[PDB]
Structures are given as structure tokens and as C-alpha cells.
From a paper:
SNARE (soluble N-ethylmaleimide-sensitive factor (NSF) attachment protein receptor) proteins drive membrane fusion at different cell compartments as their core domains zipper into a parallel four-helix bundle. After fusion, these bundles are disassembled by the AAA+ (ATPase associated with diverse cellular activities) protein Sec18/NSF and its adaptor Sec17/α-SNAP to make them available for subsequent rounds of membrane fusion. The disassembly requires multiple ATP hydrolysis events in the presence of Mg2+; as few as six ATP hydrolysis events are sufficient. The side-loading and side-release mechanism explains how Sec18/NSF can disassemble SNAREs with constrained topologies.
Numbering used by the authors:
A (entry chain I): 1 to 188, 195 to 292
B (entry chain G): 1 to 191, 195 to 290
C (entry chain H): 1 to 47, 52 to 110, 115 to 187, 197 to 292
D (entry chain J): 27 to 86
E (entry chain L): 433 to 499, 589 to 650
F (entry chain K): 213 to 257
Amino acid sequence: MSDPVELLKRAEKKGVPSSGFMKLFSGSDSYKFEEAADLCVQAATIYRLRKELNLAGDSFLKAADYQKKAGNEDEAGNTYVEAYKCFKSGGNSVNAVDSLENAIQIFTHRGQFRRGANFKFELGEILENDLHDYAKAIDCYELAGEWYAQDQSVALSNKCFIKCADLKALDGQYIEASDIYSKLIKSSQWSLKDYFLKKGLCQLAATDAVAAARTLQEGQSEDPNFADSRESNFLKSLIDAVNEGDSEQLSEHCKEFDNFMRLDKWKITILNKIKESIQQQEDDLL
Amino acid sequence: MSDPVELLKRAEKKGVPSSGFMKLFSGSDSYKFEEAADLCVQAATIYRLRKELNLAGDSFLKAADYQKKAGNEDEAGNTYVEAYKCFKSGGNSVNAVDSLENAIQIFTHRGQFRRGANFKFELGEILENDLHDYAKAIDCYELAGEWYAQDQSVALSNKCFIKCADLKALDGQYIEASDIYSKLIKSSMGNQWSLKDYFLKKGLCQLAATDAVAAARTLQEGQSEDPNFADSRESNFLKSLIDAVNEGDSEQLSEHCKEFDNFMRLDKWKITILNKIKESIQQQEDD
Amino acid sequence: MSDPVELLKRAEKKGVPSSGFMKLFSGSDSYKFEEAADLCVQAATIYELNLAGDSFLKAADYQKKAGNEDEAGNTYVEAYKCFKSGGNSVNAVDSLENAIQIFTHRRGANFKFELGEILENDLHDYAKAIDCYELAGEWYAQDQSVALSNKCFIKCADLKALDGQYIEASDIYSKLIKSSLKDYFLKKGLCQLAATDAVAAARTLQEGQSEDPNFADSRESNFLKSLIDAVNEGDSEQLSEHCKEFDNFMRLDKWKITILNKIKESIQQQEDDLL
Amino acid sequence: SRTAELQAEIDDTVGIMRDNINKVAERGERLTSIEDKADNLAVSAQGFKRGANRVRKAMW
Amino acid sequence: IKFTKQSSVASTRNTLKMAQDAERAGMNTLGMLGHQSEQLNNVEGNLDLMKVQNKVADEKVAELKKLEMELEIDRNLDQIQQVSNRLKKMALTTGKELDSQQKRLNNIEESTDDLDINLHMNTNRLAGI
Amino acid sequence: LFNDMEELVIEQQENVDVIDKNVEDAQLDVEQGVGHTDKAVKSAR
């Protein structure tokens, strides 16, 4: 096998633009950038075979930069995706982010919105799980959901808006999360009951029990499957406990609900916030 | 990024045909229209990146017009489809209609009937839902269904003819809707759930035309030709409606409607047609 | 719009091969046939589905003369679609046959099956339909597409049985079994009964009962048994009773009715030959 | 118990077919895009053929 | 009681026929998907060949530039349960086939775009010679 | 759901037909084009 370091050195030597008087006699520099990109891709493939995945990613990044200089942006976007795959498999989430961002920018400029949305969602997943940059993850899930909505892909859009609303609610942006849940409801049977519950829970965490009661009434009137659901009864019981200011009754209803339908971590966090708001009002009254 | 306004101004300057003595020295104007189209497409792409979707649509329309002037009609049809997508995403349903109509005309001219039928159906959907121009939506679903029938796409043809018959029945053209349901039945025979619905809807149209005998014939036909309709709730319901219509008992009809609704929810279409049938009974009582 | 007749006349003028001294100065005639094909395709597009088909046939012939056989095969498929939609089943057959020949020399099974369907339903040329379903099933079998191969072999066995080739139909059902299983066992046995070979029917019954538990306890197995019993007793009335009993619970399709009537007739003929 | 099991199997199969409908929608969308790009490819291939022929005549 | 049993019989008869229904679609759909997936295979071969030919074109262009009722209810349920088993299996197989073809179509799209770009590039280069 | 699936696949058959025809047509044109560039190179040398 060729040495990837020597391949990269040859790529670097070829990727120098023609300067000065030589520019009058040299044809388009595009072909030189293409050949430098091919040398970088060969180096990247050899590094990938060696499981030196970060060096493969860096070589694909160099290849994509040369492809951009050649004018071959569609190839650059594909090569950025290969760089991303190498960095993600190598545990270098930062360079994976940067690779996906360049790929997404190329795909959106080329009108490949759906493709860019796929990668924007994966970018959101990296921001959420590996980097814990929840704000940018929110922005990524929102924009991906919008791109899927323009593409009439309701299911993918809903997957993104679920992730967005969940993260917004965990970040304390309860009103905006409730608005996204209202969009998810309008766009949408099993998940619908969950959306009504989560909307109401966000509203309770915003100390707006009236909006929660309205959401309950809306859901009970518009979806018969929510009306007779455990989620509706639970949301009602939580609204009642919030209006009475009884944080113990709320904790009882939470335990009762948890015994039949396990509360996931998101619901527990939001329910704890609601309880804390009740206890704070109790303390402010003594 | 280039300024899209300057790109469009350059497109406009290039897209002037060679007039006069210059026409003797200028080659084909086709290349000038191609380059103007490319400039318009670049402007449209920049507007789309800015989410200025209506301006992107207008730029694609200009590009498609230049492509037509170049003789590149297949490209013009694709660019009209991109204009349509921009206008639809921008909420400008009128320009979306006009874009699809030009694209469909090109596609039909290129013998791409199927492609035109896909877009003619989408045109029908825009006319129905956004513009409420139900007459043109009917015409769109009918013609799309015919083009799909010629392509042996029984399934798309049936989807279109369902939309056509439903809209025709809601517009009071009950006889024509019944005839389209007869076509849907015939195309669906030997292929059943939609079939029961087709039999029911045919009969309901006939009742709304105050022709209970044709409804009874449709019931007998369905009961003989498709055993699943014979034992279905839809058949029993259609029978009960025919019986109530022949007796002139609008209350019994309303009871049978409630009974049916308790087991199989009546959609908005059935409710509208059933109300019309009831009104025709009550009018005969009042007369 | 251009006039399609004028387009075809231009295609015909261009599609004349270079003859004589002109052949020394003219480049490859391929480009002339390509341009004639393009003109024919434009005319076909403007066309009046039968005239569109004929124009696509002319285009495909010019494409063949250009050496662009893959294009010719695609154009023959477009001709086929026009003729089928125009109700000209003969030219649809001819178009599919040319397309299939091109595809096999270089998909053909898909179109060979559709050809079998046209031969069966529109032309009632059942012999060629059988040949088409058999060859399509074989091509799918080589491609390891068991489901498509089985669809073709079902059509082949059904038509062979209706044509009185009961033994060959039974052999195809044996292939289908080895590769609906209950139905295949029943139909195999029925073919064997129509061949007056009740012993082979009993063997098929025993085979099915041993190899597939779902056939063992099925109505199809009990029905086949009862038919074997009635055939061995020579009681055509008991056979008709068992047919009615079976029909009350599981409707006999037209194929089964035809084969069962043949079995009954063979019993009645043996009764008459013994009196 | 047999009827409840049957109901459970039918509900599961309904779920699988519903998933499939979403997938076939994604498939139809992909196919519409590929048809557009394959049309582009055919046009570009013809253009390349013609340009190469014109250069062949030029060099000759 | 008799009326209810009769209604149950009618319900199960209708259910069985519709079970056999969901079957014809699955077998035809799988057949068509097999046909289309296979039509994709011919496309894939042609795309691979065009990639090789574009490599050749790249090098040639470069050089150029250089130069009784109870029993029936039971039996109908028997029949419905068996069909339901195949409807489930067919749905699973159809899902798997759609997954495979979806990845194949994604690759077909990318390869088609790449070829289109390469062809436009070489056409522009030939224009200048 | 099955009914709709059949319907959608019947629709998609159509797309597959055109794609196959166009890619096949393109391959033959590319092959001819390469032949032309070969003869062009032969002359230019």
C-alpha cells in the first residue's frame, strides 16, 4: 500500500494554486484540486483500513476542501459526510459536528433540503448526547423539523419536533415547548395522548393551570381515545392538585400513575418542577 | 453570494432577442436564453436559501420562460415544478396553480402523461383545499384518473375517481358521482373494503337524486356480486335507508343513521348526503 | 405542435442507409438512424394510441439499426404500453416479444409474464400463455426469486390442467410444493384424479399429511380424501355430495369446478362401460 | 384465548403495515427525485456524445 | 341468542374474506417490489458501467486538451388465524425489502448526480477544444 | 393499509420504468461519446 503521509504531501504540493506568470500558461486549477482531492481520499481510505479513524477524517476534510476549490460541491458534501462518519466512529464529536455543518451547508445550497435535514438531525443528536450543547441541539431539531415539514414528511418532522419540545421543556422554555406540542397535536393515536399530557405538564410548570385545563378540555373533546385515557385522568388530577396547592396529593397522583404507566425521566423532571412551584407558593403564604 | 437582483437584471439583459441587422450576425438566440435561465435559476436558489420563497418562485418562472424560448421544454417543465414547490411552500396557491398548469402542459406535450397526472392531481388538491375551486378540482381529478387509467395504474385512477365522485356528490351532481362509483366498483371487482364503501356511496347518491329504485338495484347488484357487501353493515344500512325513503319516514332514516354511526362513524361526506336525503323526504312530506 | 406525419416522413427520409459511392464519404449511418428514431419518438409522443405504438415500433427499429439495442428494448416497451392501452393486443404481443428478445440477449421474465397474461386473457392463445408462464417461472427460478417463480408456475399449472395436461400440471404443483401449500396439495391430487390415477392422488394425500401438519388437519386434505374414496368406489353421486359439502364451507373456484366435473365424468364413463 | 391472540396478531400486523406505508411514501419520493436526475443524466449523456462527436470532427 | 350467533357468523365470514384480501395485496406487492428491485439492479449495472466509461472519458479529454353456527364461527376463526399469520409475515418481509431498496435508491441517486456532474464537466471541456 | 400499499407500489412501477429507460439510454450515449473522444485523440496525435 502507498504511504498515506506521502499521498497527503503530494496532495498538498498539487493543491497550490497557480500564481503569477504561470497563471497565464496553466489551465484551470480545478484539475489540480481534483487530483489533490483524489490523493487525500486515497490517504483517508488507507487510514480507515488502519482504524486510524481521526486521521481518515482529517484526510477527508482536506479532500472536501480541495473538491470545493475545484467547484465540485456535491462531491465535497459527500466527502464531508465520510469525514463525519470517521470522526463519529473515532469519538471526535467536535470534528464530526464541523464536518456535518459543512455537509449540511452544501446540501441546503444545492436544494437537497431533505438530505440536509437528515444530517441536521444527526447533528442535533451529537450536540445533545456527546457535547451536551442542548441549545444548539434544540436549534438543530427545530430547523430539521421545519425542513421535513416543507417536504411533507409529517413523521420525520414530528420526530424532530418531539426532540425539540422535550429539550425546550427540560431547559425551562415551557411555553415554547407547549406551542411545539400544539403543533404536534395538530399534525397528528398512541403518541397523541402523550402529546396532550406533555403539553399540559409544560403549562403546569409555567404555573398556568388555566391553560392546562383548557388543553385537557380540548383533548377530551377532540380525541375520544384521550378522553378515556389514563393520561387525561392524570393531567386532571395534577391540575386539581395544583389548584388546591396540595403538593402531597400531587406526589400521590404521581405514584399512582407511575405504578400503572412508568414515568420516564422527562415527566419526572417536569413533575418535580410543578411540585416545587406548589411548595414555593405554600412557603410564600406562611 | 451574488445579489439575486443583479443576477435577474443580467438575465433580463441577456434575454432580449436579437433584433434587426444584428440578427444577421448573431448566432441562435437559444444560447442567450439558456444563459438568462441559468442566471434566473441562480437568483431563485439564493432567494430559496433566504426563505424568500415567493421571489424564488418568480425567478424560477422567469427561468422556465427563458428555457421555453431556448427550446428546452423538458427543463422548463422541471423549473415550473420548482416554481410550484416554492410557491406552495410560500402559501401563494395562485402562482402554484399557474406553475403546475404550465408544467402539466409541457409534460403532456412530452407524452409524460403519468407525470402530468401526478401534478394534475396535486393541482386538484390545491384547487380543493386552498382555493375552494371545487369545479376545477373535479376536472383535475377526472382528467388525472383518465390519464392513470390509460397508464394501467388502476390504483391511482381509483384514488382520483374517488376524489372526483366525492366532490361531484357534494356539488349535487349525484347521478354523475354514482356513475363514477360504478366505474370504481367495476375496476375493483375481483380485486373489497373500498368496494363496500363504493356500493354504499353509489346508493347514497341515488337516494339524494330521489331515485330509490336505482339504489335498490345497486343494493341487489352488490349483494349478488360481492358476498362481503351482502353480509356487511353498509348493505344493511343502505337497505334500511331505501326502506325509510320508500316509506317517507324521515325519523326512521335519522334513527338508522344514529344506529350506523354508533358502530361505524359517519364521515362528513356521508352526513352531508344523508342530510340531503332526509331533506328530500321532509320536502315530500311538506309538499 | 409539429405534425407527427411530417415528423415520420422526415424520419423515413433520414433512415435510408447510405448506398453506393456516397458510402465512401458518409460517416457511420448510426447517427442518421438515431435522428430518425428521435423524430419517430416525437411523432409517437404527439399521437391515437395505436399510431403512437406504430411510431415507437419505427423508432425501435431505427434504434436497432443504430446499434442502440437497449434503447430499442425500452422503446418496444413503450410501444407495448400504447398498444395495450389501445386494445391492439396483437401488436402489444409483437412489441413485448421484441423487447423480451433484446432483454434476454443483454426483465424479460417480467415482460414474458405480461405477455402470457395478454395471450391468456385477450387472445385466448392458452398454449403460448403456458409457454410464457413456464419460461418466466424458470427465469425467476434462476434469479432465486421464489415468489415470482411460484406465481408463474401457478399460472402454468392451472392452464395446463385446464388444457387436459393433468400429469404435467401435477408435476408443476410438485415443484411448487417443494419450493398455498394446502391449495397446491389439493390441486395436485385433483389433477391426478382427472388423469384417473387415484393411487398417485392417495400418495399425494399421504405425503401432504406427513410433511405439513397444517395440511393434515385441513379441509383440503379431508376433501381430497373423500374424493379419492368416491373415485375408488365409482360413486359419482357421493363425489357430487362431497363437492357440495366442500363448496358450502370453502367456495370452489371455476378451476376446481372444471377439474371436479372431469373427474365425475370419468367415473360415470366407467359406470357406463361396466353396464 | 385464541380470539384474543388473533386480535393481538392482527393489531401487530396493522402496526407493521402502517410502518410500511410510511416507508413506501419515502420510497415514492426517492423515486420521483431519481427519475428527475435520470432524465438529467440522459440529457447530459446525449450532450456529451454530441460534443465529443464535434471534437472528433474538429481534430479530423 | 340465535340472532347474536347469526351476527357473529356474518362478522367472521366477512373477516375471513378480508383476511384473504390483505393477502392478495401482499403477494402482488411483493411481486411488484421484486420486479422493481430487479429493475433497480439493471439500473445499478448501467451506472457502474458509466462510472468506468467516465474514467476513460476523463483521461481522453485531458489528453485532448494537452494536444352449526358455533362450528362455523370456529372454522372461520381457524381460517382467519392462518391468514393473519401470513399477513404478518408478508408485512415483515415487505418492510425488510423496502429498507434494502431504500438504501439502494439513495446510492442510485448519489451515483446518478455524480455522473451527471462529471458529464457536464467533460462536455464543457470539449466545448473549448 | 395493504390496499394502499399496492396502490402506491403500482404508482412507483411507473417511476422505475422511466428511470431504467433513461439510465440505459444514457449509458449507450456515454459509450458512443467515449468512442468519439478516442477517435479524436487518435487524430490529434
